[PDB]
Design a binder for this molecule. Structure first.
Ligand SMILES: Nc1ccn([C@@H]2O[C@H](COP(=O)(O)OP(=O)(O)CCO)[C@@H](O)[C@H]2O)c(=O)n1
Ligand SMILES: Nc1ccn([C@@H]2O[C@H](COP(=O)(O)OP(=O)(O)CCO)[C@@H](O)[C@H]2O)c(=O)n1
Lengths: 126, 126
């Protein structure tokens, strides 16, 4: 099969930054969205306005998205070990600040099966 | 070809109500979104936070959407005469209130080539 591309998202309100990520991810293979739960999101930022099921109804309908799975924690390891993607895609915002430790763990965990992180310039102004 | 289904949207922030409309519309054929411009939207409600190009980047990436065209006015006639869709889909909110006259004109204009309006229960609570 095609490679598996894992994309973590809160995705409270979809905007062109998200679309950019998904468009870049689709270049790498079939996208599985790791849709973060309330509890995951609450652990590092403000809770979203929309519920998990509401956010899922939107994101599952974005072009390029093959599957959507819950990501119950900010940390990606448990999901990465289950789905074993070839790629993870994220914006470069998480090189600094609250998600940096989670980013480092994505790189180290993916190395276990030779997966790669691909980072995209964050879309400014939105 | 498949039937052409016209769906008017401001689509400032996509939520499951919109997804429902698009999912119902896709049952009828290939979706063309009439994406309303600022000037169109300003004529009957508050201006959106996102620009036309920002809203288009999102909506063009929704599953089932074949084409996106600007709709420069609240009134649908000019676009309907150009695209000549078999169907128009809208929520039933516009049976009452500010869009009711536009709704009536959709029905009458579509009759010119035997197109039909299909209305969907508005998604409450969002
Ligand atoms: N203006 C923006 C806003 C978001 N993004 C990227 O979208 C992706 C999804 O963002 P979000 O839903 O905020 O998810 P995260 O909180 O980063 C999920 C956990 O890593 C992410 O890769 C982010 O860098 C982006 O590239 N540009
Ligand atoms: N909770 C909601 C919100 C919107 N909708 C439907 O989505 C469609 C798009 O809504 P919007 O982007 O607000 O477009 P309109 O301002 O109605 C476009 C001009 O008719 C429309 O058919 C509306 O009835 C819906 O069915 N349920």
């Amino acid at each position: 099969q095609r490679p598996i591309v894992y994309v973590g998202m809160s995705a409270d309100l979809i905007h062109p930054g998200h679309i950019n990520i998904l468009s870049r991810a689709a270049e790498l293979g079939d996208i599985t969205i790791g849709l973060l739960t309330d509890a995951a999101i609450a652990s590092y930022k403000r809770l979203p306005h929309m519920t998990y099921e509401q956010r899922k109804a939107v994101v599952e309908n974005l072009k390029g998205v093959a599957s959507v799975v819950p990501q119950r924690t900010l940390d990606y390891a448990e999901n990465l070990r289950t789905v074993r993607p070839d790629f993870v895609v994220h914006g470069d915002d998480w090189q600094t600040g609250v998600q940096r430790h989670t980013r480092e763990r994505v790189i180290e965990v993916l190395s276990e099966w030779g997966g790669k992180l691909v980072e995209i310039p964050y879309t400014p102004g939105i």
